[PDB]
């Protein structure tokens, strides 16, 4: 956090524009208000998704470090961290992220591509510390990203 004073002032200006209330912090109701002001139809479910995906430490609403880090994100044009989400997002036929690893591997390792015969399944099973399988993105991410 070695931001220069001019950049601190610029980000403070941005935060002031975002925070219409200024008690320091706009609340979810006026998050939805400004979102619909931009011209999007708001839903309470998606607003809850927004707030509980941006908030941390259970403080609620918005926080200055939280805003600073989420603005540290969404600036890189491309990456291999926040764009590999699809690798577990798209193959969830059930959609809750609890579909069997063996079944998804078998059904998705044949779309014009073939890799091995159950060796990939064995490797996936051994990758998990507890051998959970199913949809366990922690071990897969630990193996892939680093």
């Amino acid at each position: 956090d070695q931001l220069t004073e001019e950049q601190i002032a610029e980000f403070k200006e941005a935060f002031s524009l975002f925070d219409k209330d200024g008690d320091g912090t706009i609340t979810t109701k006026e998050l939805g208000t400004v979102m619909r002001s931009l011209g999007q139809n708001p839903t309470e479910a998606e607003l809850q998704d927004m707030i509980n995906e941006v908030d941390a430490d259970g403080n609620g609403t918005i926080d200055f470090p939280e805003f600073l880090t989420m603005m540290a994100r969404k600036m890189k044009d491309t990456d291999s961290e926040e764009e590999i989400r699809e690798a577990f997002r798209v193959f969830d036929k059930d959609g809750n992220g609890y579909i069997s690893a063996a079944e998804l591997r078998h059904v998705m390792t044949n779309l014009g591509e073939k890799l091995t015969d159950e060796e990939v399944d064995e490797m996936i099973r051994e990758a998990d510390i507890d051998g959970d399988g199913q949809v366990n993105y922690e071990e897969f991410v630990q193996m892939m990203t680093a």
């Binding site: 699809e86 998705m108 779309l111 890799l115």
Partner: protein, 360 residues
């Protein structure tokens, strides 16, 4: 109730008179054409055929005058019987008197016989002026449609403000024939305009008065390139060429609405096209995701084993696959947003139906 029968008889008589007017105008223009070109093709020593043609055209104009007088008398009779009065003189007024006098003097002019193929370009002006009879055609064609006779059409026009008397047939013809008559008129005007242009250049052995040489500049005058090899600079030639140019450039601006309508796309097939675009994009996205994961696993393979130039190339391939995935996702998002947008009429119909069905 006899007014209805009287009006029907008046309209029938008007139709007959309009038909006779059109056919006699055709005979007159045919006689004028026959008299023309005789000096430049043939010989003047016959001394009888031209006299017979002139006398026949004189009788034709006399009968045309008589039928025009009869038609105007019948229409003023129709006006009188519509506005029920008992005075012959009260029907006439300034406007109709001016109109009938103008029609008479238009018909009044007539190329009459006086008693090498060089007519002097001054004695044929009256014969050339017979083209003015073109305005007598719309009056006949509008009434000759027969749409006015159907009582049901007038009934439906009632209980509403339409007052269809003129431009109504034009609108109906444009609706039923967007360009069918337009193309024919545009293609047929060229012969007449070349024929009327080949009068001022009628100079003996000038290589310009002939019809074949004449029918070269008008197509390019209607066009825009107009390099102008002929460059005719005779008397009134500048006015004639300017008129041809202005009418041509006015007529250039068309065909755009009809070609757009023909190339237009109906919503019925648009729906199924969007549906299949959705399914194809889903297939493409699944294929891209499979490619991404397949390339990703090999990186961990080379991480477990020794890394090398192959591992570096596979990293490059992984980046390329990520870029392709992003492109496919962006395109699918664009198409989905587009299809979700618009759809105004169907969505409001559905929402109003739901509101009606909600009741209490």
């Amino acid at each position: 109730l006899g007014a209805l029968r009287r009006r029907k008889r008046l309209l029938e008589q008007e139709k007959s008179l309009a038909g006779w007017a059109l056919v006699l105008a055709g005979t007159g223009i045919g006689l004028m054409v026959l008299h023309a070109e005789m000096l430049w093709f043939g010989g003047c020593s016959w001394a009888l055929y031209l006299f017979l043609v002139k006398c026949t055209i004189s009788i034709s104009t006399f009968l045309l005058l008589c039928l025009i007088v009869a038609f105007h008398a019948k229409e003023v009779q129709l006006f009188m019987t519509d506005n029920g009065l008992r005075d012959w003189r009260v029907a006439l007024t300034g406007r109709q008197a001016a109109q009938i006098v103008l029609e008479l003097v238009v018909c009044g002019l007539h190329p009459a016989p006086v008693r090498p193929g060089f007519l002097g370009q001054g004695e044929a002006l009256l014969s050339l002026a017979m083209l003015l009879r073109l305005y007598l055609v719309p009056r006949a064609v509008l009434l000759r449609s027969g749409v006015l006779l159907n009582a049901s059409y007038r009934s439906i026009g009632a209980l509403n403000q339409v007052r269809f008397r003129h431009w109504f047939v034009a609108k109906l013809y444009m609706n039923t024939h967007p360009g069918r008559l337009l193309l024919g008129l545009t293609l047929g005007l060229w012969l007449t305009t070349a024929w009327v242009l080949s009068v001022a250049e009628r100079q003996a052995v000038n290589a310009t008065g002939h019809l074949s040489d004449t029918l070269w500049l008008i197509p390019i005058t209607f066009l825009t390139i107009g390099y102008g090899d002929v460059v005719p600079g005779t008397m009134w030639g500048k006015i004639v060429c300017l008129c041809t140019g202005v009418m041509g450039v006015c007529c250039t601006a068309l065909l755009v609405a009809v070609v757009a309508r023909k190339l237009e796309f109906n919503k019925a097939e648009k729906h199924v096209h969007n549906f299949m675009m959705d399914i194809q994009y889903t297939k493409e996205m699944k294929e891209s995701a499979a490619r991404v994961l397949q390339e990703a696993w090999m990186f961990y393979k080379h991480t477990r084993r020794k890394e090398s130039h192959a591992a570096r190339r596979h990293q490059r391939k992984l980046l390329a696959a990520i870029n392709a995935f992003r492109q496919v996702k962006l395109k699918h998002r664009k198409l989905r947003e587009q299809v979700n947008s618009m759809v105004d009429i169907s969505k409001m119909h559905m929402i109003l139906y739901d509101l009606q069905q909600n009741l209490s």
